[model samples]
Target: APTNLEQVLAAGGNTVEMLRNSQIGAYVYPVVAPEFSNWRTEQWAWRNSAVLFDQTHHMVDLYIRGKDALKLLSDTMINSPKGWEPNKAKQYVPVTPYGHVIGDGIIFYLAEEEFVYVGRAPAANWLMYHAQTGGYNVDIVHDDRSPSRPMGVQRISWRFQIQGPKAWDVIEKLHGGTLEKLKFFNMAEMNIAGMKIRTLRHGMAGAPGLEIWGPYETQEKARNAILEAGKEFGLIPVGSRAYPSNTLESGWIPSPLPAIYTGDKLKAYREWLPANSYEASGAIGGSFVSSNIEDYYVNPYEIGYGPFVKFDHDFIGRDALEAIDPATQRKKVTLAWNGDDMAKIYASLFDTEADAHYKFFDLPLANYANTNADAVLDAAGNVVGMSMFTGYSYNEKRALSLATIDHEIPVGTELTVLWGEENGGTRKTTVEPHKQMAVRAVVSPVPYSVTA
Candidate 1:
């Protein structure tokens, strides 16, 4: 790592430095350790009370202004942008022409013709290419430029995710007011600490949560203020290390990870490539990269996002998606590993004379910016499905994971989860399902946030 945490924080603006120091080129993005000491603490606060996270690394702000901006976006992705009013946000997954995922991001309608897409850096190119290819009158601008040295040309913002069941109470205390009337997925402008900021009511851990955006200068003050206010409510800081487990239990799948491509023809991908490939203006997080080909991508249907796949208008992947049977196995489901069986897997590792290699759960310690989609098995040793993102959750008191499994397994059904290496190699593990294993889970009907 860098000499100190300050260097890492400052390097957030330096594309080359951030990538090199984080060892992102080696496919490793450090999350825990000295660099993100605040992450775990912040995660604990969000789970029990309220906490703030420095999300400047993952956000890709886009400025959209044009007569046909809304219409242009609606035709490009699965969700319709018409219902998104100003100060409101909607979660969306941008897919390739063949229905595979390009990247996962959110659209914030700041005005009728203006909006910002915040989340992963990869989606910036996805949107730009769509506008260019279709010859839309919209203008797309990347906001990753940092004005300060090391921070790059991207503007820096501190995002505070006020989570947990009592989040509203903690937020109200910090603001010296009440936000009980604030609806989910809604955004409003607020003046806190004599500074203007944007607050969006959105959940990510199957609990009530808010994404508060503000200027970089006020980050330390705002974070300390909130932490002090939330102390009475049992708030703790959580890092990226615990974020994946929460996201999985909440029924939200990260983009470019679990999405399975369902496009019908290669020609469709060829037609969209020219206008759809632009890199972020500043440093990109995570080193894992994949080809834009349809085979390697995923559509909204395959990743449990079929509900958002409206057929009201013509879209890039409409034809292939329409051909898919609605009753087909597309909805997202939760998976729980049995504890006793998990222990047995660990014990088996000591037996050198054992017939098969032992598999232990590989918990991700930092943000690698890529997804692993190896198949999972049942106790009978048959392929059941695959786990996408894995992490540790302090709240749930167990190692957890999220995956898109075959539709055959019901939510409450107990099954042994097979994990570890693909081939009969040196590492392998099998775990049984447990009820509390899903620390932050939601069914198809629930939102990924804590409030809903």
Candidate 2:
């Protein structure tokens, strides 16, 4: 009966409980087929040759323009705006007044007064709320992510990433000539099949690439051109099933719970948020159980965004962020699950004689909720960190997860990940009755592909 998130919270009992038991089902990567030539080969292509990642449907797009556009962003985001100009992009991060991260996305400075944000719903929701109520002279438009189950609905725009070891070669082939590889995150335009395609300098698997997008109608024309150009390069289209797992190799934790559920200062924003919004209805899955929802919240420093926090500009959480020292925060790392332990987890699936099976570790990706927070524990059984993303990489032939562990826990140290829900799991539709597994994993450097 509640109209907004605040009232929905009040009507619901405990925040963590409501979320863990949420029936929203699995967070889907819709539209794209689950595979083109099997997820394993699709994944292998990204590292060995090239891959086309169809990013058209899963992320929200927000267009913010007008006289106050820069002001609105500089006032809210932790990333500094000095020298930021057109044809550039930044991984924009906004935080609560308490200095906990809300959400992150790529904000492209398209022109003098125009910008577009591309990311998950929570961040777009936050930006929309401020544009409407913060008294800024900004014109904003929200193009929501395509429905989780579109049923043939069309998205407004098409986004795609051509990446992997030979990505530059494919990109040049599509451009029909030589193309300069700009520094990372810079924005530019390039010719593709005679159409001017906008590109964001990006990389994956230690190779430079581009993230290109345009009006939805142009999707096929561009897609076909790239595929045609990439034929000789061994480039294959990566499907939705193997798409999200790419983060494991790149070291980006895509789904940190937006830290806006608490704090009296945020009550108004929560009330502004619709009851059915992502923050209110999204589910949480993993073994890290805490009565306090705040326990799951992470600050920018804790999650490897420390370098983006610039004191050059005054922002919403500047004061709080300034008071903290980045040196003391937990460090982000890749967790290489012990091969034997990972094999055992799968082995349990066939152990019909056993009392119960281990949690169903879905291939490539294992997350069952919108946000995951598996417990990372030391040998002594003390919680030392949180594993935020889980997946397997065919290139590495090992199960891997991205996590934030204590700074003192050096890389190569072993830790235990308590996999699966407790008490045979919650009522979330994604879970089947199962037992948890204390899978052993070793801490490794982020960007798991890079030799550190």
Candidate 3:
């Protein structure tokens, strides 16, 4: 039951091979039907209209069960599990010993001593290390995203997300009767279309919705049923193309560089991570050029995870987090880009193929969904914050980015973002001799859209 990720990362040819284009995670799955609907339409569907996003096998699902399951998690994660009860889920974030985000995902308390963690790959690996090294009496199960392996592999479940203002209309129909007030972040069991399902009250796309998951075998039935039920709500099926763009509006950053990459204390952990792991493979894109990798290490307050941190328990980096005064901590904000600058970058596509133009903005989403970022600076040209997960919103008709900036920088304040490469595009980037430029943007609240 060994992951062999550390061994894979340490293998001799991984370095050079990864530079070419290394892949990771389980069998992969994308938004329901890619290319069926464009990113803008999909974005619009999830905001003004209802949309269904297929989460089935799209994320790595890790399970920890046993006597010390909660103990190992409580000590290592930043979020306290003091009041955790079955059928409830919280956005779980675990930082390195240095108080930097290792990785974050949704942690669900299914039953006593049983928890399900699903999200990006890095955190699962982190959990694996401790689950083994801590000598905890727990069982660990990893159901990687489906694309990494062939079929015939049994998976825990398939996930689906419904969002937009009218999201509930579809869920109500699937409920076969009606949804009697469900509390946010809470969960309940339901039988839908003859398939038993678990629904989590979740929010994304700046709208009310529920994220549901259940037996993978019933995926098609559940998907079709939801689609049929949503006919009147304009529920469009979404694919990966528009999936990441939701973050720009909701302001939920999916991943950041784990702090474990450099410190001498974590040298072993660093080595254990894959060469293609977020630590080794993270591409610092956009105009933020820094020789120091630590510059990209995210902080809780900066990313809007501060509310989840509690002082009742002593966890890794608890002291460092305690020292960070909320008065001084940078806050999460939205960066609405200037139309002129966004257009200027697009014009560069006319340049020769060999010539390095600014890093081309892949409209709607990045080629690597979660690996986008830029630099945020104050009016005086001081590097004040970092911006990531940039995209366009059809509903708002503007390009937006999720950024961390000084709290003193109020909403509507103008700032500059360094776009493109500093030297040239890094090895991980596919750009040419283009120079980085400062793009103007205005600050706003983290969630770009507001709902009732």
CA shift of 308, model 1, Å: 1.3
Ranking by TM-score: 2, 3, 1
What lDDT tens digits, residue by residue, belong to model 2 across residues 1-452? 89899998998999999999999999999888999999999999988999999999889999999999999999999999999999999999999999999999999999999999999988888889888999999999888887888665576789999999999999988888899989999989888899999999999777899999999999999999999999999999999999999899889999999999999999999999999999999999999999999999999998899999999998998999999988889999999998898888899989979989889998899999999999999999999999999999988999999999998998888899999999999889999999999999889998884322
Give one digit per residue, the lDDT tens place, for model 1 in 1-452.
34322333334564333322232222222222222445455555555555554455445677778988887778877776555678878776666555666676778887878977876655665677667777899888777522222322235555667778677777777777766546887888654566666888866454666778776678777878777877788766655454444564465666443222223343333334332122211112221222331222445765677878888766767776777776755445545445455556557657678565344444433222344443445456565555555544555444445555556655554444444432232111122121211122222222232211
Q: Please give the ranking of all candidate structures by lDDT, highest first, separated by commas.
A: 2, 3, 1
lDDT score of model 3? 0.74
- Each candidate's TM vs. the true structure? 0.72, 0.98, 0.89
Where model 1 places Cα greater than 4 Å from the true spot, the runs are: 1-44, 144-156, 204-207, 257-297, 344-369, 378-382, 423-452
Candidate achieving the largest TM-score: 2
Global CA lDDT of candidate 2, please?
0.92
Worst 10 residues of 2 by lDDT: 443-452
In TM-score terms, candidate 3 sits at 0.89
Error of 3 at 434 (Å): 2.5
Q: lDDT tens digits, residues 316-392, model 3?
A: 88998988887788888888888899888887778666355656676675333244457798878999888877767
Q: How accurate locally, in lDDT, is each candidate?
A: 0.54, 0.92, 0.74
